[PDB]
Paper text:
To further understand μOR–Gz coupling and signal transduction, we prepared [name]- and endomorphin-1-bound μOR with dominant-negative Gz for structural determination. The μOR–Gz complexes were purified with [name] to facilitate cryo-EM studies, which yielded 2.8-Å [name]–μOR–Gz and endomorphin-1–μOR–Gz density maps with clear densities for [name], endomorphin-1, and most side chains of μOR and Gz. The overall architecture of μOR–Gz closely resembles that of μOR–Gi (root-mean-square deviation (RMSD) of 1.0 Å for Cα). An overlay of Gz and Gi shows a similar conformation in the α5 helix but a 2.8-Å displacement (measured based on the Cα of Ala7) in the αN helix. The μOR bound to Gz exhibits conformational changes similar to those of μOR bound to Gi, with an outward expansion of TM6 and a downward shift of helix8. In the Gz-coupled µOR activated by [name], notable alterations compared to the Gi-bound µOR include a 1.1-Å upward displacement of helix8 (measured at the Cα of R8.52; superscript denotes Ballesteros–Weinstein numbering), a 1.1-Å outward movement of the TM7–helix8 hinge in the cytoplasm (measured at the Cα of E8.48), and a 0.6-Å inward displacement of the entire TM1 segment (measured as the average displacement among the Cα of I1.33–Y1.60). In the [name]–µOR–Gi/z complex, TM1 exhibits the highest B-factor among the 7 TMs, indicating enhanced flexibility. In our [name]–µOR–Gz map and the previously resolved [name]–µOR–Gi map (EMD-28088),23 water1 is absent; water2 mediates the interaction between S1543.39 and S3297.46 and is present in both maps, though it was not modeled in the latter. Compared to Gi-bound µOR, W2936.48 tilts upward by 0.7 Å and 1.2 Å in [name]-activated Gz-coupled µOR and βarr1-coupled µOR, respectively; this is accompanied by a conformational alteration in N3287.45 that preserves the H-bond with W2936.48. Due to the movement of W2936.48, the H-bond between N3287.45 and N3327.49 loosens, releasing N3327.49 to form a strong H-bond with the conserved residue D1142.50 in the Gz-bound µOR (3.5 Å) and the βarr1-bound µOR (2.6 Å).
Numbering used by the authors:
A (entry chain G): 9 to 61
B (entry chain P): 1 to 5
C (entry chain R): 65 to 347
D (entry chain B): 5 to 340
E (entry chain A): 5 to 57, 183 to 236, 239 to 354
Amino acid sequence: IAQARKLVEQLKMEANIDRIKVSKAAADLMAYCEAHAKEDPLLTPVPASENPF
Amino acid sequence: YXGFX
Amino acid sequence: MVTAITIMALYSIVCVVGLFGNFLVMYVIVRYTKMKTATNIYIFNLALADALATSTLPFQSVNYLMGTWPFGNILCKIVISIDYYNMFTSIFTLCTMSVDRYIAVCHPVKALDFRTPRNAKIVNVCNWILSSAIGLPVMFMATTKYRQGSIDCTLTFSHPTWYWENLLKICVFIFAFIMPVLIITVCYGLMILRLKSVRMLSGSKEKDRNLRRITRMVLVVVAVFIVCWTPIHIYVIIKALITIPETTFQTVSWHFCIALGYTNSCLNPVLYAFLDENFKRCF
Amino acid sequence: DQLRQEAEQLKNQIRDARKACADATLSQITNNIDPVGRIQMRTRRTLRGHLAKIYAMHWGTDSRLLVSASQDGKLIIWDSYTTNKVHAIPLRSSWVMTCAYAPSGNYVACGGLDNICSIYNLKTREGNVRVSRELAGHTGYLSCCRFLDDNQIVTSSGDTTCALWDIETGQQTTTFTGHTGDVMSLSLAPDTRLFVSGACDASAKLWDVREGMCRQTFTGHESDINAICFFPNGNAFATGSDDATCRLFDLRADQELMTYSHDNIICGITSVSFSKSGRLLLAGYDDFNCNVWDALKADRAGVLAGHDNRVSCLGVTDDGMAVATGSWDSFLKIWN
Amino acid sequence: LSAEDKAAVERSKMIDRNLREDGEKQRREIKLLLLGTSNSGKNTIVKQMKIIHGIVENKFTFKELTFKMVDVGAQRSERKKWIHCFEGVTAIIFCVELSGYDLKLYEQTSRMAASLKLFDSICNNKWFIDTSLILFLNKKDLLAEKIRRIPLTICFPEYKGQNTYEEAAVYIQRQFEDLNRNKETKEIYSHFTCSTDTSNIQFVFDAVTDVIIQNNLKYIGLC
């Protein structure tokens, strides 16, 4: 019976959590991707002179 | 093989 | 007239199909298998030996057609050397593959210690070097003689000529017929005797069919080698013992035996590469 | 008895809250940005020397040194530029499933079906690399290991539990429990305060390393989750599972955002990773190649088809110059 | 081209030489995956094959062949997530408690039915299609002593025959071997373990010798 009750307090802790609307979290992820776009050698190829490979 | 000779 | 065109056609088709088969085997090996396995290395060696040996057919055909050698001494010596060298190389490669299969089947424990690509390369190099012990003496001893209306390739005859001919012919016969035949016969007989006891072969109907296919392949390979190489050796031995008159039948038999000896090189790729299961998986 | 139905009611409340929270799901707002386009990464280096199945790799924080592990029993430190093997560490147990490289570069970690995490000291005296620690206490198998610092390491085990250890002491400081299936992967947050672990329950749980308690739980997959990695900002993560699908969960939204799957893909995911911008998600498949997805479009941007067997590991440098993929054909390939 | 670079390259070449040397030995040695239900006899058979004349790896040589048995029984985790690393294992030594048809305790567990289910799960597994299984049946003396007292029908309702040792053992072998749904790709080598002058290792050596013969035939292209 310990497992069930323990899951019950775990679910209480899970439920009492602030949520952020996905239109905000997704917008933040997109903004982070846009901000660091230039500092991505894979997305933007680097010239062979600066490319160490 | 037997050729030339 | 019919005899000459018959012999020329025989050589022409034999040479064409031999080079085509050998070069296709080369392309398949270099594109797909990359010689990453001992058996692939041995097959590549066999293809190389067979190819060069087949390449010596146009020169013989031209020599017979014109009755003389127009290529000169420089091409004559290298052609004689290539002929002897690559004939011995191909025979020794067949012996090597037979012994390799015998070791793989009858000696599984030691096959882990020895059957490695490095050892395959070592054995290939050893065979190529050992073939030089005959290819190079015939390279030096090759000579070009002149007659009132002919230029002929032959060998220089160190005294006594009779002793020299007997020694060379007996050595070629022993090291090119008796030893390979004994080696392949013993190896494949023992291999079949051992394969009769494998649970994956001595089982249901499909396993019995696989065992029968293996036995048929071994027997057909041995029979092809024997049938292709026995007539030329036997007829050369007979010619060196008794005088044979120059007739149409004699010339046709002579050239048919030679073309059969080369046909062995032509058929080897089919027996060893095209009918090999691993090559068939290369879609 | 009442505990069960009250827990069910709590689950219903949680699902209702998450369903009310979501209104975009990354599809109605990222449709107005330009696609990344066609990406062709070429093979710059090939690391040969492994003679068995390669199960894990981990990049160095200097973006030059690399570590790879193998079924034969060798942890190899490679120089990614010169292809030279910096180190070759023989393992006591060849059944390794994960490897880790310390952020300071002084230690490496190897673990697997031996129930022990071995910590090897690289930058030592007397020359060769020696074993510094053997962390024992798991009863399954270590499927992932990650360093927090030179002394704190987080391990995911096959006995449904994760552990945080202090290397010097050798004992667990906290044990993260709650999964009902084997834990396959792990990913530390960029600030190293949180981490996420995916398990065979098709569930990924977020743990806080300070107290040892699960903060959030994410579901949505239909089979075992084999790979997990954080987004570069630490506000999201991506999972890959045996259902031939990757998913992107958000910590603040506490729910799934986007899915990455295709009709022509039916094999599971063995490894995932992100680019530095977070725009590209690189996933290793059992189809003998790797796929580069656009993390904001769910589209497949590229294919790293250079391997002859199942890619089992995939990693990106801390500066993002190149991607190293290791597969079961015993070769690592570096791509750019 | 610097001196340090040349020293590093020489170090890399020496490491390559060492890796090639170790790898040769690893290829030569034979790996056998030891599997079986709880209380079947894995530890007993390992101890016998050693001294009859986490992971426990047991390495020893017999007739110039090196065996490395990998026992993972003490580990508690889901098998399908770690069995994949045993792909390409030469063979699987599967142990069965032959006298356990009525000793079903474990944690109505039907320990013999547990052995059948385990054999079904691993023999038909996708990772062991071409991997042969050496089936060991332990405690045959216990079966002989017990079968005359307890009928085999307590475990197999469909059994028909005399309640003595020979027919019961043959029936159990049939009931284990008929779960193989891949008969054209893998073979099962059944044996009775016994405390004699190492007949177990002799049978293992013969079975792995047959496996190497099959593998060699595949390598040389005959198969």
